[PDB]
Amino acid sequence: MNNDDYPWFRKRGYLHFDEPVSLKKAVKYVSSPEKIIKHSFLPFLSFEVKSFKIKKDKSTKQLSKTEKLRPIAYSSHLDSHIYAFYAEYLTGHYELLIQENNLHENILAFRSLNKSNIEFAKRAFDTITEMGECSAVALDLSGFFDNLDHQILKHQWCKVIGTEALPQDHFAIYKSITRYSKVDKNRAYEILGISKNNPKYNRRKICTPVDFRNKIRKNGLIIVNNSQKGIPQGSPISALLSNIYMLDFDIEMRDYAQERGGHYYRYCDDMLFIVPTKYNKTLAGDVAQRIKHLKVELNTKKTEIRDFIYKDSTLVANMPLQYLGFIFDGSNILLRSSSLARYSERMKRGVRLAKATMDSKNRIRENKGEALKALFKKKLYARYSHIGRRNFLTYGYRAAKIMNSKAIKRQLKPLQKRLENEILK
DNA sequence: TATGCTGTA
RNA sequence: GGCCCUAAACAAAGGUUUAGGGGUAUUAUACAGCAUGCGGCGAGGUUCACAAUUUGUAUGUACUGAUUGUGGAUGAGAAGGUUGGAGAAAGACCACUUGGUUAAGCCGGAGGAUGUGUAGAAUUGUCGCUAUUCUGUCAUCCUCCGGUUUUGCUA
Ligand SMILES: Cc1cn([C@H]2C[C@H](O)[C@@H](COP(=O)(O)OP(=O)(O)OP(=O)(O)O)O2)c(=O)[nH]c1=O
Ligand SMILES: [K+]
Ligand SMILES: [Mg+2]
């Protein structure tokens, strides 16, 4: 066999309750609907990622620390092959329904369009530029993957496959993905005696099946989503189901924008409306009235309305507009500051770890009487400077090249001297 | 006595 | 205790409850970018343990200095700490380890000051082939306005 004929097959690298299968067994298993109906689905493994960001209180001029947690959940190997195979099945029907409704240019995320966020941001900013005096309204959903109603998702899934009810293997996958069960990874590693720091030492599965059935299940580690909403974040099929969920709302929003001479774009839960200025007040309530049929609700705290006028030749905004990592002021395109702050943090951490390792090995050379050596800089320049082939700066100069922006090049210019001064520190 | 791979969501 | 299979009871749901059994090696996702760029040269030794001799002495034995071989580790282009295990040793493996404290750091635009300038320059231990970046809307500093989440010190 050869992997090119089967594009859905990807070999997963993580530990789980099972261990990865070959291509030859996987193809023979997932292509039989009789196996899918009688499949014994394993629970997801779960963990949460910790993040801090700083906020300045405007009433006090004192800094505050805020916290955000994201529930990660990922499935076992054979279940991942089943989800990838049925995502490959559903993708063709969804892309036919895109072309039948002329939604090809409006729906952006999770589609194999051979384009990146730079081209989508360029399309949006060029649309604003071509339209002239207009208003851009940006919207967002609060907890998108955690609030998908199961019956609405079932109705959209039947509409995409073209039936009044799900067939048995499609219904089995629907039951597995909606009323999902999950096991916390750290509690499993505590109970099984697996080290949290080096879990892969001398094992291929997390545990034998009898240890699963006694230690994992009977100690109450399996938690079942008995609520009527949400899908897990990290399955191969979840992004496609999030696109299938929104389809009739995307048709209605395209009709709403096209009636008023406007445009509509959606990238996951990031909706952008570009409309004439007289519609800027009414739109934000009109979208919220229509979206309650899907039972997801708007994140009112993130909503931004920006108005564009000509300053005697130049289109200027009242405040700059952020979309997919770029900042648009009306004629100028800039990089979002969060990526530059992330780059500064990663660069300083990397140079500090390199200096720590340089201090580490020189103490060994001192003991043997060998002469000391200076800091090796090949890995430092490869990851944090323009000389390396794939880093943050290569993305920045690609963005400057595509969007024809000298302002992005002015942002990236002091980073070389900052890397050199961080090395010389 | 101090910790390990771009971009968007 | 979720999931699947078998059997039983109660009615008629894409059902509940009970009893028994099971989980197929050969640290997240989806699109996009890109395939720590590529190829030579460092390398003489050092350390640890055995083995054959001969060397300073005692009585086949006790050690012990040095040659000479066999094997483990190691210099090499930054994966940090603890003298905690294993070990003959290891810069390798196993175990624990992703803290605290800060109030400012970055991006853009206005007011100022301050220093002067079409081929050349910069980039890895080193060399060669590439590849990328900069070059008066010049560079540094101090107050405002808007955005953003990092910055310094210390284990
Ligand atoms: C950022 C991010 C998003 N996603 C998916 C899951 C999210 O439901 C979806 C959109 O996420 P976001 O809109 O980026 O964030 P959010 O919806 O969770 O809201 P908040 O920022 O307040 O937390 O994209 C990931 O799977 N991994 C990621 O790292
Ligand atoms: K080299
Ligand atoms: Mg959201």
Give buried/exposed letters for A293-319 (b at 16+ CB in 10 A, else e): ebebebeeeeeebbebeeeeeebebee
- The answer to whether residues A137 and A174 belong to one domain is no
Other CB atoms within 10 Å distance of the CB of residue A105 = 13
Could you identify the residue written with the tokens 């209180």? Answer: A57
Q: Which of A236, A261, A291 represents a domain boundary (last residue)?
A: A236
Round and report the angstrom distance from CA (A370) to C1' (C64): 31
Here the CATH number for the domain that contains residue A250 is 3.30.70.2630
Distances from the Cα of A118 to the Cαs of A80, A125, A138, A410, in angstroms?
A: 30, 10, 18, 18
The one-character DSSP state at A167 is -
φ/ψ region of A127 (left if φ > 0, alpha if ψ in -120 to 50, else beta) reads alpha
Experimental technique of record = cryo-EM
SS3 A3: helix
Residue nearest to nucleotide C32 (CA to C1'): A116
Distances from the Cα of A144 to the Cαs of A140, A147, A301, A342, A394, in angstroms?
A: 9, 6, 15, 25, 32
- The answer to whether residues A161 and A201 belong to one domain is yes
φ/ψ region of A143 (left if φ > 0, alpha if ψ in -120 to 50, else beta) reads left
- The answer to whether residues A317 and A270 belong to one domain is yes
d(CA A198, CA A196): 6
Cβ of A145 less than 6 Å from ligand 1 = yes
Tell me the CA–centroid distance for residue A5 and ligand 1, in Å. Answer: 32
- The answer to whether residues A344 and A195 belong to one domain is no
Give buried/exposed letters for A106-127 (b at 16+ CB in 10 A, else e): bbbbebeeeeebbebbbebbeb
Other CB atoms within 10 Å distance of the CB of residue A356 = 9
**Rounded to 5°, angle at Cα A250 from A246 and A256:** 145
Cβ contact A237:A80 at 8 Å: no
- The answer to whether residues A143 and A156 belong to one domain is no
Tell me the CA–centroid distance for residue A298 and ligand 3, in Å. Answer: 9
- The answer to whether residues A246 and A365 belong to one domain is no
Strand partners for A264: A273
SS3 A45: strand
- The answer to whether residues A117 and A21 belong to one domain is no
Cβ contact A45:A180 at 8 Å: no
What proportions of chain A, in percent to the nearest 5, are helix, strand and coil? 45, 20, 35
Record the tokens describing residue A240, joined without a space.
Answer: 């496609």
Q: Which of A239, A407, A272, A411 is nearest to A338 (CA)?
A: A411
Q: Which of A211, A236, A261 represents a domain boundary (last residue)?
A: A236
- The answer to whether residues A270 and A232 belong to one domain is no
d(CA A425, CA A422): 5
Q: Which of A182, A205, A236 represents a domain boundary (last residue)?
A: A236
d(CA A219, CA A191): 9
Query: How many domains would you assign to chain A?
Result: 3
A245 touches strand B (CB under 7 A): no
Task: List, comma-separated, the residues after which chain A is broken, a break being a C to N distance over 2.5 A; otherwise answer none.
Answer: none
- The answer to whether residues A49 and A164 belong to one domain is yes
SS3 A359: helix
Record the tokens describing residue A209, joined without a space.
Answer: 């099946």
Protein footprint on strand B: which nucleotides are under 7 Å from a CB?
2-4, 6-9
Compute chain A's Rg from CA coordinates.
26
A344 touches strand B (CB under 7 A): no
Domain that holds residue A163: 3-97+149-236
Cβ contact A241:A109 at 8 Å: no
> Which of A160-165's residues contact partners 24+ apart within 8 Å by CB, and which partners?
A160/A90, A160/A93, A160/A94, A160/A97, A160/A244, A160/A247, A161/A90, A161/A93, A162/A93
Q: Which of A24, A145, A35 is nearest to A79 (CA)?
A: A35
Q: Which residues contact A368 (CB under 8 A, 6 or more apart)?
A: none
d(CA A47, CA A49): 7
- The answer to whether residues A254 and A392 belong to one domain is no
d(CA A204, CA A20): 9
d(CA A250, CA A228): 23
- The answer to whether residues A341 and A305 belong to one domain is no
- The answer to whether residues A319 and A248 belong to one domain is yes
Cβ of A79 less than 6 Å from ligand 1 = no
